[PDB]
Design an enzyme around this catalytic site. Structure first.
Site, PDB file in Angstrom:
ATOM      1  N   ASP A 295       0.892  -1.163   0.000  1.00  0.00           N
ATOM      2  CA  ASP A 295      -0.241  -0.023   0.037  1.00  0.00           C
ATOM      3  C   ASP A 295       0.880   1.196   0.154  1.00  0.00           C
ATOM      4  O   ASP A 295       1.459   1.475   0.948  1.00  0.00           O
ATOM      5  CB  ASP A 295      -0.859  -0.164   1.162  1.00  0.00           C
ATOM      6  CG  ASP A 295      -1.911   1.020   1.008  1.00  0.00           C
ATOM      7  OD1 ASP A 295      -1.940   2.008   0.008  1.00  0.00           O
ATOM      8  OD2 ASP A 295      -2.524   1.440   2.314  1.00  0.00           O
TER       9      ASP A 295
ATOM     10  N   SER B  46      -0.478  15.653 -12.126  1.00  0.00           N
ATOM     11  CA  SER B  46      -0.892  15.236 -13.371  1.00  0.00           C
ATOM     12  C   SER B  46      -1.136  16.217 -14.241  1.00  0.00           C
ATOM     13  O   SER B  46      -1.445  17.307 -13.824  1.00  0.00           O
ATOM     14  CB  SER B  46      -2.082  14.272 -13.467  1.00  0.00           C
ATOM     15  OG  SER B  46      -2.409  13.917 -14.876  1.00  0.00           O
TER      16      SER B  46
END
EC number: 3.4.23.22
Length: 330
Positions: A35, A199
């Site tokens: 994770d 992004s």
């Protein structure tokens, strides 16, 4: 040193991935959910409330000659999905794919919430976010990666998640045969303890690319792709019959649909998520309403590049003095 381990989807939807981890001496092999959105290595154990164990493999520290109670240390964690776990702490030897860390904090669960009990395939979590998020008190503990870093050939790990197929976590090296083209690296902020990056925009299907900054986290522990409501609305508007359902808890779409791809930007590069990766199947057994793999982050407080996005790429988690993330197509 290096390590290399295969990671395997837990079910036919890729809801999560498990990776075998050796703990203790003699080794006890548990299948953990790696994770990158959390920083605790915790396991079902001989100390877990018996009624909260339903098929998981447990770590028994009393059977490990290298286990040592970390005196006074406790842990307690709550995840974005509302699940939680807590317990005490041992140090022990932990190996992943041939890479061994001695003295790793292994957090032994005394309590786990229902969603963990109900998932017999996940024996615990191995956190790979930054150690500043580790919950051990009163002495915060380091992640497996943080402990291994100095010994690694290169201070990196990579995630290569499969679509309906096994993939690989590598530590300490970049397998140049595992991706196509070049790896594009992008800046990371560690200020929230995550692999947080920006992004450069998105496209829906064959549509034109929209240049817009989307701050979010690379999170292997989250199944889906959570993005701003504007972006998610633009995606689902291209799917006839798709709608946001408050009763179901997100966007659903007719199971008869063919989904468009979704592209996200990494600098000047582009990662394409095929439409099929966005299909999470019937909302309930036999339903013709299917659950979408791209969902709004509006109620989270952060955008999350979960497995839906990450499995479309070869992803480098660069733990150099100034961390960065790298993405390549594959």
């Amino acid at each position: 040193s290096t390590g290399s381990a295969t990671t395997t989807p837990i079910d036919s939807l890729d809801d999560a991935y498990i990776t075998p981890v050796q703990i203790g001496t003699p080794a006890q092999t548990l299948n953990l959910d790696f994770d990158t959105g959390s920083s605790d290595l915790w396991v079902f154990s001989s100390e877990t409330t018996a009624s909260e164990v339903d098929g998981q493999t447990i770590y028994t520290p009393s059977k490990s000659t290298t286990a040592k109670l970390l005196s006074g240390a406790t842990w307690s964690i709550s995840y974005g999905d509302g699940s939680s776990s807590s317990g005490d702490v041992y140090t022990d030897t932990v190996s992943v794919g041939g890479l061994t860390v001695t003295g790793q904090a292994v957090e032994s669960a005394k309590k786990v919430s229902s969603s963990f009990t109900e998932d017999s395939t996940i024996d615990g979590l191995l956190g790979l976010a930054f150690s500043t998020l580790n919950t051990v008190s009163p002495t915060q503990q380091k992640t497996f990666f943080d402990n291994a870093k100095a010994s690694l050939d290169s201070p990196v790990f990579t995630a290569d998640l499969g679509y309906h197929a096994p993939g690989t976590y590598n530590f300490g090296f970049i397998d140049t045969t595992a991706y196509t083209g070049s790896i594009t690296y992008t800046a990371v902020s560690t200020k929230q303890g995550f692999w947080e990056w920006t992004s450069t925009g998105y496209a829906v299907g064959s549509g034109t690319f929209k240049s817009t900054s989307i701050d979010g986290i690379a999170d292997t522990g989250t199944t889906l792709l959570y993005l701003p409501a504007t972006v998610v609305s633009a995606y689902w508007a291209q799917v006839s019959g798709a709608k946001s359902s408050s009763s179901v808890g997100g966007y659903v779409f007719p199971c008869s649909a063919t989904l468009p791809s979704f592209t996200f930007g990494v600098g000047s590069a582009r990662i394409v998520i095929p439409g099929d990766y966005i299909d999470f199947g019937p909302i309930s057994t036999g339903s013709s309403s299917c659950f979408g793999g791209i969902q709004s982050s509006a109620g989270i407080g952060i955008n999350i590049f979960g497995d839906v996005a990450l499995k479309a790429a070869f992803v480098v988690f660069n733990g150099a003095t100034t961390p960065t993330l790298g993405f390549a197509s594959k």
